[PDB]
Symmetry: C2
Subunit: 186 residues, 2 copies
């Protein structure tokens, strides 16, 4: 599948991403302005907009399950629980051992039909194995879905069962940068 640009109707944030029509989960990404005289930033802002039957969602930032930074999140009541994780094989991803900061932004909403996680991901484009994403080029992102609750929803490091679906989408990161990035943070 292929990402495209879209606007959050509540916030007006402008993202690049997709809506999976099966689970009707929206995934959106936006990056700071491209630098020419300095190295690129290592942070980005993203969103997951998920129907409440979505019990956990994961994002694979390198487009595959293994050896890339993963983001995992779920609703637990009126709060999002989230974590940065990693998998070396096809088994339970565990806490990421590098430096990465996931911040839930206040635009994050939970209501009766959907949870909407809006986050800041710092240190998420370069990983502690030397891998990462190139925000000036084209890449692939992937997502994981489950409709089964995590084993212990109040724990960010909870274990859980294999996703019931997963998918991919191509993204041209060179088009996903925004001059309004700073304002989104504010």
């Amino acid at each position: 599948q292929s990402a495209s640009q879209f606007t959050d109707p509540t916030t007006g944030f402008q993202f690049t991403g997709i809506t999976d029509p099966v689970h009707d989960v929206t995934y959106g990404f936006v990056f700071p302005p491209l630098a020419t005289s300095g190295a690129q930033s290592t942070e980005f802002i993203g969103e997951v907009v998920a129907p409440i039957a979505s019990k956990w969602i994961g994002i694979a930032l390198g487009g595959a399950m293994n050896n890339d930074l993963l983001l995992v999140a779920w609703a637990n009541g009126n709060q999002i629980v989230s974590s940065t994780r990693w998998a070396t094989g096809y088994v339970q991803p565990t806490a990421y051992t590098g430096t990465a900061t996931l911040t839930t932004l206040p635009e994050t909403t939970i209501n009766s039909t959907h949870w909407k996680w809006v986050f800041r991901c710092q240190g998420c484009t370069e990983w502690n194995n030397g891998g990462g994403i190139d925000v000036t080029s084209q890449g692939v992102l992937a997502w994981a879905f489950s409709n089964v609750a995590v084993d212990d929803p109040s724990d960010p490091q909870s274990t859980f069962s294999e996703h019931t679906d997963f998918g991919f989408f191509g993204i041209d990161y060179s088009t996903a940068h925004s001059a309004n990035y700073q304002n989104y943070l504010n």
Copy 2:
């Protein structure tokens, strides 16, 4: 997703299609030679190679659930049960009333781990609603998956529940024809 050309390693048939990595079902299509002179053929050969946990599979020949010819099939023991269907709104597709003949070809194989349905679809590029597929152009195909058994597996017109997954792929019909099509038939 995008289709590519591949060869069936047992039969040697050359198909254009994809493998869905979630349910590990392969969808392949091959068309008779394009005509330079006159109307195109209205038939094609296809295959579904599915793990036996796949309880029913559907193919949407127009790339959508509604207003296009649908093919539905499942394993019932050591036989494939299949039918042509049509959907009026997002409800249980019913028997197609147009001109289309679905034939199970002798290459069809069912074993302990997979069912491989190889079929001939005559009259399937033009539908009795006046719609159809343009075999000289680029189009979209879709598939539907369930891991739950149909309500009556011995009935080709069995009712069944909503698919648990569905997906799409782009296909360049202009490169999906084969000079060996007639040999596939004999």
